[PDB]
Design a protein around this ligand. Structure first.
Ligand SMILES: *[C@@H]1O[C@H](CO)[C@@H](O[C@@H]2O[C@H](CO)[C@@H](O[C@@H]3O[C@H](CO[C@H]4O[C@H](CO)[C@@H](O)[C@H](O)[C@@H]4O)[C@@H](O)[C@H](O)[C@@H]3O)[C@H](O)[C@H]2NC(C)=O)[C@H](O)[C@H]1NC(C)=O
Ligand SMILES: *[C@@H]1O[C@H](CO)[C@@H](O[C@@H]2O[C@H](CO)[C@@H](O[C@@H]3O[C@H](CO)[C@@H](O)[C@H](O)[C@@H]3O)[C@H](O)[C@H]2NC(C)=O)[C@H](O)[C@H]1NC(C)=O
Ligand SMILES: *[C@@H]1O[C@H](CO)[C@@H](O[C@@H]2O[C@H](CO)[C@@H](O[C@@H]3O[C@H](CO)[C@@H](O)[C@H](O)[C@@H]3O)[C@H](O)[C@H]2NC(C)=O)[C@H](O)[C@H]1NC(C)=O
Ligand SMILES: *[C@@H]1O[C@H](CO)[C@@H](O)[C@H](O)[C@H]1NC(C)=O
Ligand SMILES: *[C@@H]1O[C@H](CO)[C@@H](O)[C@H](O)[C@H]1NC(C)=O
Ligand SMILES: *[C@@H]1O[C@H](CO)[C@@H](O)[C@H](O)[C@H]1NC(C)=O
Lengths: 267, 410, 344, 49, 49
């Protein structure tokens, strides 16, 4: 009595999930049904496969979203033997496959004073487009509130683009946008909003994040340019310091075990 | 705190006894400076195949062990001394080198055979394959056997299976080898952890598999990329970015600067992004609210009950059998045979720097490609001294998703 | 929770025992979580013992009572979710699983450790489904249940009351109408009824040798099984026959007589399931405005009797005798709410 | 095995030891408890073990 | 002192028994139940690790 039905237990409703059952060494007959006949048998996904020897015929019974959370409809699987009923207990795992979505953006960081412009996507288990509506979507203001909205929008080719404004003084920082589905799949993407200056100086050290015990020569490489093409003919020093010992500054100097000064004229 | 941080390059996730797996380990340290060929002392322990060697230039070196051991095989290498000898009595004291502390456990094969497979676990050419290679065996040669056995190769695809492909070849009654021809193609339509599987379609009732997997790095179904009028000075408004995809596909025109993105580069912005932005990809074996089961079998007699050479209550083990090798990919199945180990039911007695540039918008819009490739005009924003990009994207059901990942115009 | 429902169903309750029972429930729930698993599962110990696996019959009980306890007050859905799916994965290829023996007490589970009646506990406890869903896990429990039924009924002995009675109530809250009927009807043949009631008993002279004090290693599980005998009959999603109500008040006369002055019964399983059987017997027979059950006898010898039964004359025994040698006294009952009569 | 007394009570019972190492034997006409009046502190009869 | 002491018994099979001792009778034990003593280099004294 040889038979083995490789049943993948992970689910994506009404989308491709191929399946085949194993047999070799011909017996009387085996045509097992990996069924889903219920407690009363009303609802099932009865795609029985015959079983013949030393081959495999894989079939994709793709199956629905059932009730509130994913219900398999009272699963049962009977081994189809002609003069045998060798049959006992085993189930399946269960979830509902939304049409899966995301966001891309121009930026997250934005300058108040201009507008915003943004797009959305939705696909399936597989990675091909999908034209299906939404219940709603709305740009979030950080105070537990909603600032933009286009209710029940639908895609054109699996996509859509809007362009929303932004006041020249909002609350500063991350500004969320989320889509939620008729199940409620939340897909979240911010846009940072900060009026940080354009600082009119740059200096950028290179220096060991990792200097370790036995080392011969450290070449801390330092050149930052205030506009990326305009440095000074000048001088620079830098507080390479041996540090990191929690100090009350009782010395009057900070926690340096050493502060070394390998300063040089900027070429 | 530590010095000389070694590695584990291509070592066995786990192993089996009837074949020597090859250990491989590398090193990096300090300036990225493992010596080419500084010697080590390769700790053959309890299999006792101590066989010193040294690195290659990469850190790498290959090394194996002998075969004849219980599951409890402990394996490692050291490169420098063992204990904390110098100036070490204060309790404000520690000084270490890295431990190559690897272990594993052993097939439970009362099936007595298995397959031993080799990796892809590194960078990858896609839209390709290679002659896949493992090492087969058979036991008692074959006790009675057959003329042939079927070896049809399962591949756990997207939490299930996608492809169809068969193998199998003769059985010689009383002689074994470890060679097997197979190959599978790398395309798409796949959970991007490549979970191969293969076994003997056995008549006496057992299966041989494991977590024996590969990689699926960034490669695509639908492709698209670009071509533009050149980097030019102030007034070069009339330009192009000709981009090319499937015949009928809505696609994007996000021609852009890239400095304010050099501040925050493409962190969640990639094809590996759109891969792993999927949810619930491969929830495998025993997920969160998921568990093993009380197989009604039991090895219970009223006393400690081990035969052979020892008084021992049923020797509490911790190793790897085949019912868990059904778990380690993600699928269920059904099986009358003996695949799970004989664990019993207990008895009555025993129980950041902020780097921004000017913000104004340059290009953002959508067109649809044709059978010949649209040549959309990028239009210049002068007074902008920088390197540029177009973070486009295209999509259609006749081709599937696609993306122009990388390009540059200064 | 079962006595909370039982007291509320009777209608002689108080919102004070109710609110202090909110307190009971919150604290007790939380302390169940003191001993559960980090994965979702449930053992006796839990925290500070990270590496472990929960318990099967235990977790069946906890999902059951999570069902009913949510059925009275608020729970969070994730608990029933993760536990229902725990029992769902407790599933390799085919077999009817057994106890992952880690008990501290063989009596808290009144059963006799066979996977037969364990599995049947799973199917009932996972079909009784108050207001949530019971998706995958429970039907394959019915499947193994049919399997063990084939093994048993193809034989003739499974203690002759216990396993097949659990089959009865399992098929009943399943509704395997011909099948529940076959097994409970065999039980009806295998009768151990009382002089004033009905009840069932395991062999009582068991084939294996027995012990000394309370017959140890064997809870004797009468009020749990006989409840699980009682429980098959009341089940039908519109209604069973009134034969079910007759035998129910018979076996429940036996229930209340088998109770003792403290509270509950000789375990927790029997107490829970007795109280729930009784409660939903009531939930069938009890409704607020339905308190209007009118009555007559009709005997042709100008000797009959009219009666009435309500919510506030709700239970006076009417001790009444008859002059005729034969009893040819034709009943009649109209109105609302069920009644218990006993003639002899 | 079930057996009985010869004139001496001898029983030539033989158990095939196709089993394992650490045993724990047993011989009774009664069970693993002082069948009448065991846990009373005031009853003082026993079946020989 | 004659000892075959592996780190563990090396039972590659059903289980990984570590160094797993026993109490089976010996002929050392036949002779000391008997009582007397003897001299050989054969296998009598079990190979206790
Ligand atoms: C990894 O471990 C292996 C096993 O230990 C090493 O294999 C050894 O390789 C050597 C060289 O091929 C073999 O030849 C031996 O060499 C030693 C060297 O001794 C030297 O010093 C003595 C001092 O008296 C001097 O007399 C010799 O002439 C040498 O200059 C000899 O002592 C041996 O007699 C023999 O010729 C060994 O057979 C082999 N095993 C041994 C004994 O280690 C292998 O070398 C290691 N990996 C490396 C780093 O090569
Ligand atoms: C550990 O690895 C070694 C290989 O380095 C394995 O030894 C090999 O075992 C096979 C099978 O016994 C040998 O083949 C035959 O050996 C006999 C010895 O008398 C010889 O007469 C035959 O003509 C044939 O060669 C093989 O020679 C041997 N390796 C060598 C020296 O080439 C060994 O099996 C592994 N582990 C253990 C201990 O099993
Ligand atoms: C247990 O306690 C509850 C206390 O609420 C008892 O009363 C039940 O309360 C519910 C509240 O919804 C009643 O539902 C009713 O439905 C009708 C028709 O939609 C509506 O007009 C009423 O305003 C009310 O919402 C329910 O009838 C009532 N009895 C039940 C639930 O059977 C309850 O009697 C006690 N018994 C139990 C449930 O154990
Ligand atoms: C094949 O399997 C079936 C089902 O268990 C069994 O009844 C039969 O004896 C086996 N042998 C043949 C050749 O039918
Ligand atoms: C199964 O349940 C559905 C629920 O709508 C019902 O319509 C149907 O009649 C039931 N069974 C059948 C197919 O009769
Ligand atoms: C144990 O099994 C053997 C098998 O040949 C049998 O002869 C013997 O009677 C059995 N027990 C004994 C020793 O009586």
């Amino acid at each position: 009595p040889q038979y083995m039905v490789l049943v993948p237990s992970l689910l994506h409703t009404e989308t491709t999930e191929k399946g085949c059952v194993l047999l070799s060494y011909l017996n009387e007959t085996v045509t097992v049904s990996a069924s889903l006949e219920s407690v009363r048998g009303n609802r099932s996904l009865f795609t029985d496969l015959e079983a013949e020897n030393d081959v495999l015929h894989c079939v994709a019974f793709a199956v629905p979203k059932s009730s509130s959370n994913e219900e398999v409809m009272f699963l049962t699987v009977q081994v189809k033997g002609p003069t045998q009923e060798f049959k006992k207990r085993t189930t399946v795992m269960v979830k509902n496959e939304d049409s899966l979505v995301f966001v891309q953006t121009d930026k997250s960081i934005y300058k108040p004073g201009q507008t915003v412009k943004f797009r959305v996507v939705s696909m399936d288990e597989n990675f091909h487009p999908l034209n299906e509506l939404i219940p709603l979507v709305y740009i979030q203001d950080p105070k537990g509130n909603r600032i933009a909205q286009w209710q029940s929008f639908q895609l054109e080719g699996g996509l859509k683009q809007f362009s929303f404004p932004l006041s020249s003084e909002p609350f500063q920082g991350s500004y969320k946008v989320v889509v939620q589905k008729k199940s409620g799949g939340r897909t979240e993407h911010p846009f940072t909003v900060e009026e940080f200056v354009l600082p009119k100086f740059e200096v950028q050290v290179t220096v060991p994040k990792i200097i370790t015990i036995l080392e011969e020569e450290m070449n801390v490489s330092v050149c930052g340019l205030y506009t990326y093409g305009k440095p000074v003919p000048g001088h620079v020093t830098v507080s390479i310091c041996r540090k990191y010992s929690d100090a009350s500054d009782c010395h009057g100097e900070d926690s340096q075990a050493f502060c070394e000064k390998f300063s040089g004229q900027l070429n | 705190r530590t010095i000389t941080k070694l590695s584990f390059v291509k070592v066995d996730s786990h192993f089996r006894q009837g074949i020597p797996f090859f250990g491989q380990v590398r090193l990096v340290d300090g300036k990225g400076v493992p010596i080419p060929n500084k010697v080590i002392f390769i700790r053959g322990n309890e299999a006792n195949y101590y066989s010193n060697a040294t690195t290659d230039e990469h850190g790498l070196v290959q090394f194996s062990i002998n075969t004849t051991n219980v599951m409890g095989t402990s394996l490692t290498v050291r490169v420098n001394y063992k204990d904390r000898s110098p100036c070490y009595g204060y309790q404000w004291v520690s000084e270490e080198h890295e431990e190559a502390h690897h272990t594993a456990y052993l097939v439970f094969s009362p099936s007595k055979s298995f397959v031993h497979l080799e990796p892809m676990s590194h960078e990858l050419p896609c839209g390709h394959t290679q002659t896949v290679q493992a090492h087969y065996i058979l036991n008692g040669g074959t006790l009675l056997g057959l003329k042939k056995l079927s070896f049809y190769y399962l591949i756990m695809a997207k939490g299930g299976i996608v492809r169809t492909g068969t193998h199998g070849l003769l059985v010689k009654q009383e002689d074994m080898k470890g060679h097997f021809s197979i190959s599978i193609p790398v395309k798409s339509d796949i959970a991007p952890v490549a979970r191969l599987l293969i076994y003997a379609v056995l008549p006496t009732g057992d299966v041989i598999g494991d977590s024996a997997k590969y990689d699926v790095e960034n490669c695509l179904a639908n492709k698209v990329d670009l071509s533009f009028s050149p980097s030019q000075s102030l007034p070069a408004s009339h330009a192009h970015l000709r981009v090319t995809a499937a015949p009928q596909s809505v696609c994007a025109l996000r021609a852009v600067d890239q400095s304010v993105l050099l501040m925050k580069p493409d962190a969640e912005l990639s094809a590996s992004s759109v891969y792993n932005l999927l949810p619930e990809k491969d929830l495998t074996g025993f997920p969160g609210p998921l568990n093993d089961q009380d197989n009604e079998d039991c090895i219970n007699r009223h006393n400690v009950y081990i035969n052979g050479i020892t008084y021992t209550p049923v020797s509490s083990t911790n190793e790897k059998d085949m019912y868990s090798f059904l778990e380690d990919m993600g699928l269920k199945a059904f099986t009358n045979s003996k695949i799970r180990k004989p664990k019993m039911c207990p008895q009555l007695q025993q129980y950041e720097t902020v780097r921004k540039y000017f913000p104004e918008t340059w290009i953002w819009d959508l067109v649809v490609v044709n059978s010949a490739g649209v040549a959309e005009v990028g239009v210049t924003v002068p007074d902008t001294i920088t390197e540029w990009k177009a973070g486009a994207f295209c999509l259609s059901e006749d081709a599937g998703l696609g993306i122009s990942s990388t390009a540059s115009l200064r | 929770i079962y006595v909370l429902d039982y007291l509320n169903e009777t209608q002689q309750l108080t919102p004070e025992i109710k609110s202090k029972a909110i307190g009971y429930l919150n604290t007790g729930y939380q302390r169940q979580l003191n001993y559960k698993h980090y994965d979702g599962s449930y053992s006796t110990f839990g925290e500070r013992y990270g590496r472990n696996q929960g318990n099967t019959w235990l977790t069946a009980f906890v999902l059951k009572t999570f069902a009913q306890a949510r059925a009275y007050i608020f729970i969070d859905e994730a608990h029933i979710t993760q536990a229902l799916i725990w029992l769902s994965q407790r599933q390799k290829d085919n077999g009817c699983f057994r106890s992952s023996g880690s008990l501290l007490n063989n009596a808290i589970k009144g059963g006799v450790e066979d996977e037969v009646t364990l599995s049947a506990y799973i199917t009932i406890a996972l079909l009784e489904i108050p207001l949530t869903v019971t998706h995958p896990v429970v039907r394959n429990a019915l499947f193994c249940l049919e399997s063990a039924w084939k093994t048993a009924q193809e034989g003739d002995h499974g203690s002759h009351v216990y396993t097949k009675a659990l089959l009865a109530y399992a098929f009943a809250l399943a509704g395997n109408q011909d099948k529940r009927k076959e097994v409970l009807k065999s039980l009806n043949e295998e009768a151990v009824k009382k002089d004033n009631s009905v009840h069932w008993e395991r062999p009582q002279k068991p084939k294996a040798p027995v012990g000394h004090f309370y017959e140890p290693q064997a809870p004797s599980a009468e009020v749990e099984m006989t409840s699980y005998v009682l429980l098959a009959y009341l089940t039908a999603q519109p209604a069973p026959t009134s034969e079910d109500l007759t035998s129910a008040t018979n076996i429940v006369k036996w229930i209340t007589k088998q109770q003792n002055a403290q509270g509950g019964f000789s375990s927790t399983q029997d107490t829970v399931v007795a109280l729930h059987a009784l409660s939903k017997y009531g939930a069938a027979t009890f409704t607020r405005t339905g308190k209007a059950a009118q009555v007559t006898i009709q005997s042709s010898g100008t000797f009959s009797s009219k009666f009435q039964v309500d919510n506030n004359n709700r239970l006076l025994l009417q001790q009444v005798s008859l002059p005729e040698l034969p009893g040819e006294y034709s009943m009649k009952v109209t109105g609302e709410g069920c009644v218990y009569l006993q003639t002899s």
